[PDB]
């Protein structure tokens, strides 16, 4: 071990039942947050009926970061690209060791739990949800929150990477169980 794995994903929407997974990107870091490596980023196809589906603030969002061209032009699907990150994880640590790290992984891992099993599998049944700190931040030491700002960036390989810098944030705060 010694190794977490960071995901986080893009969807159609938030009904972790009916929306689907349109961007996955990995990384990982070592256990003092530094990065070892940058997993595949892959846009998944979609039909262009999906994409208009959605909601507005998603559609917008998606346009904008060109994610929505990404998913249209895409010929990976989900058992791809769920293939690709599982052999890129196994160059740097075996299955069942590391929790899932990111923001909001619980939502990520009910998506992965039905359209790619093999790689939810792969990881530790724990979550290492940075969420969780920022809720602790929000209710007992507000000004914490101040010093972070997430990058303009929108794609799924700058998110894992905001929420890894985050977490790196709020470590500064935590005295002694910062380390
Ligand atoms: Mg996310």
């Known amino acids: 071990n010694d190794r ?11 009904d972790t039942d009916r929306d689907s997974i349109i961007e996955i990107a990995t990384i990982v870091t070592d256990a003092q947050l ?32 060109g994610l929505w061209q990404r998913v249209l032009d895409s010929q990976v699907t989900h ?16 299955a069942g060791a590391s929790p899932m790290c990111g923001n909001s992984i619980c939502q990520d891992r009910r998506f992965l739990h039905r359209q790619m099993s093999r790689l ?7 979550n ?5 700190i920022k809720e602790l931040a929000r209710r007992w030491a507000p000004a914490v929150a101040s010093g972070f700002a ?11 990477r905001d929420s890894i810098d985050e977490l ?9 169980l910062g380390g």
Not at 4 to 14: F, Q, S
Not at 79 to 94: C, D, K, P, S, Y
């Open 150 to 160: 997430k990058s303009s960036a929108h794609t799924a390989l700058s998110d894992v």
């Open 128 to 132: 290492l949800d940075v969420s969780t």
């Open 4 to 14: 977490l794995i960071w995901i986080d994903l893009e969807m159609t929407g938030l």
């Open 120 to 126: 939810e599998r792969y990881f530790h049944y724990r």
């Open 34 to 65: 530094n990065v070892l490596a940058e997993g595949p980023e892959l846009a998944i196809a979609h039909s262009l009926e999906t994409l208009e589906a959605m909601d507005e603030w998603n559609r917008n969002q998606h346009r904008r970061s």
């Open 79 to 94: 058992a791809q690209a769920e293939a690709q990150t599982v052999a890129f994880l196994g160059e740097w640590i075996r």
């Open 168 to 176: 790196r944030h709020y470590r500064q705060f935590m005295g002694t």
